[PDB]
Design a binder for these strands. Sequence first.
DNA 1: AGGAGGGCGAGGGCGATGCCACCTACGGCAAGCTGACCCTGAAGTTCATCTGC
Length: 116
Amino acid sequence: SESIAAWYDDLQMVRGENSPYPEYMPLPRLLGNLVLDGKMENLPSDLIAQITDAALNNRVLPVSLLQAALRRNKAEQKITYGRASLLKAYINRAIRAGRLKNMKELTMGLDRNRQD
DNA sequence: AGGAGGGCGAGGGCGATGCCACCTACGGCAAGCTGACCCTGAAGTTCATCTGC
């Protein structure tokens, strides 16, 4: 579990009370925040088939999440938990891989700091 | 000629410099396609070739 734990701990994101979002958010429903409108068109080679490999193995989430999650952020004009959480996972693992050098890893909570 | 040419002290006092609401409506953020070709196998035999006879 140390790779799925790290997947669901890099993916941890804030939830209020009675948040309709699961504590650990399912990958298909998580990747469904990257998809056009429903999770089947998320690219079965750099995405659903590679996020899972980047999740099952604690590898670095592909840039195609920033790219896709950002695409949906400004395309759905909102950041669903699942795009915030998935971006938190990407950026946390980009930091941890030294792929995002200066930045420091995100936390669950709002960082009333972070200067970024 | 030798004059004296102002001396004085005031030059704001008082309050007000905003009230009211509005700062959006609406909808769309995609469509469509592709996401790969090709091979590379075990296991065994054949078959062409070589060495030795």
